[PDB]
């Protein structure tokens, strides 16, 4: 508080009030992944390129 108001506040504006600091960003979040249950509860036969 000895510095009191007089302090640089790197990342301010005018009277060092506006906070416009750079934003970090790595990844995004969305709906939760769902894994098909009936892959193991159903025989998997494939007619690929025959009929």
């Amino acid at each position: 508080y000895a510095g009191n108001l007089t302090r640089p506040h790197w990342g301010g504006a005018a009277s060092d009030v506006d906070i416009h600091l750079e934003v970090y960003q790595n990844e995004v979040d969305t709906r939760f992944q769902y894994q098909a249950m009936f892959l193991g509860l159903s025989s998997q036969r494939s007619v690929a390129d025959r009929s």
């Binding site: 007619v47 690929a48 390129d49 025959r50 009929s51």
Partner: protein, 55 residues
Amino acid sequence: NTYRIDRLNTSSVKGRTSGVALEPTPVRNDKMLIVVDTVLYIRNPIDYQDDWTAP
């Protein structure tokens, strides 16, 4: 797209006696053209599902 072949005509034999002028005759000509303007084509689209369900 064009192609040119020239054409040419023939003169005719004419007779003359003593003091008669030789009448000059022209030999006409022309040209012929062949122009490509049409594209023959075959267009057979096969859907994915029919491809995946047939040889």
